[PDB]
Structure formats: structure tokens, C-alpha cells
Amino acid sequence: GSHSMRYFFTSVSRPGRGEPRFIAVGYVDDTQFVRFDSDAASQRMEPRAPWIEQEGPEYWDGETRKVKAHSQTHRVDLGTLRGYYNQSEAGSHTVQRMYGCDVGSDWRFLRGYHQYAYDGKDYIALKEDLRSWTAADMAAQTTKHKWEAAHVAEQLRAYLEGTCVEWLRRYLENGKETLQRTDAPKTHMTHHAVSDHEATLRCWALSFYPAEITLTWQRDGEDQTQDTELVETRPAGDGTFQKWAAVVVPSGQEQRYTCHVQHEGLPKPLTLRWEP
């Protein structure tokens, strides 16, 4: 399996007074490992997985310093972008940043990324080659020129290709007991009778990690997308995930339908069928 380290930053300006609310979260795959919230009392990067508590107070110092640097960049950007967009001081605005690296099954660099949004829309993003930028509009074009003359992409490339992957691998090693474990989904099917002629079959997948999964229905061995409903994958709260997919079927024909489940933790896909 591939793996990824990703950080997510949100700043939300506070018109009446004070600096933006800032929240930062770090993930290794689907596992939150660190957080910073400008509203929390500690004012330090805090551990959210047990395996990151292995790191020493120098790590925590360095991560706190950096993360406050991020908060300050966003504070400035909220001001700059407000001006770029000719906006008043009355409105709250949001900046969101996400960056990180993916590695393949060999844990070698696969992909890096660094994207920025203003008020929920694309502002600027690093392109796939990590050598140039995609600016969505003319404000972002001004930012792109600044970052070009300041060779920002090159510094980011060094980090995304170098450091990011290096620490990802460290984390995968140190958190191996959970982070290198896949939890196959726990499945079952339920049945609910809508009327005298219509039944719903729901195929559940619980307790799986990572989040990536595919549930699909077939009827007599071919894919069936009509009359199906597939909920967004959702966190259980205990690090694992849940999902279900439902199909409506004519009462009595339950046996024709099969739910198929694919998941990193299942050596071959699994088929479920009602009986039960």
C-alpha cells in the first residue's frame, strides 16, 4: 500500500478584534497525529496518536515554531488577499492550505502537493512536477510571480521530495503496530421491507482502516447502480471507518443481488448475499 503524510491548515479571520482562528492537523494516511488550535491554552503542537509521543521535546519545539510560522503567514495572507479582492473589513474570510507527500508500496516518493484556497475556492497550487504553479485568477497570478522570483517551488520540492518522505517513513516505522496494520471491513447485510412489493438491502462495512473502500451491488452478476444509495465513508471515532451501500429490490428477489466489497485488507474481494 501507498502512504501519505498530509497537513491541513485553516485560518478564519475575526473582524472585530484579534488574530485569526487557526487550526492545523497532521495526518499519516487516515490517522490524525498532531494538531494545533490557536484557541487551545497550550499554544503548542499537540500529539494525537500514541506513536508520536515517542518524539522528544526538540521535535515538539520545532513543530510548534513552524506551525506558528504557518499561522502568521495565513494572518498576513488574509490581509493581503482581502486587499487583492477589494473586500471590506466587515466579513470573516478563510484561508485553507494543504500539503504533503505520498509514497508507494516501496515507501519511495510518489507525488507531492501544496494547495491554497481563499474562501473555499482554489487560489494557488503547486503543479505535479513541483516546479511551477497553477493560479486560478489574477490575484493568485500576483502571488505566483512573487513565489517564482522567490524560488518557492524549489524549496517546496526539496521538502516534499526529501524531508516529507523521510519523516513519513520514520512515522510508519515508529507507528508500525497501527499504521502498518490494515483492518479489513467487518461486513453484514440487513433487510428492511418498505411495502408489500419493495425491500431494501443494506450492505455494511464497519471497522476498516484505511478509509479507502469500494462497495458495489450486482444483480445476476452485473453491476447495478440504479436504485442504490451509497453513503460517504465516515469515521467511527476510534480510528476506523464505516460505510454502507443499499439497493432497493422487489420483495422476493433478494437472492439475485450481491454486494461486493474491496479493501486493502481483503486479499480478494468479499461477496455478501441475503439469506442471511
Binding site: 510560522a69 504557518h70 495565513h74
Partner: peptide, 9 residues
């Protein structure tokens, strides 16, 4: 491990 320091927009 965070990147060293974002550059302002």
C-alpha cells in the same frame, strides 16, 4: 514534520 515556513502570498 512541517515544512520550514510558508512564504506570504
Amino acid at each position: 514534520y512541517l515544512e520550514p515556513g510558508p512564504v506570504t502570498a
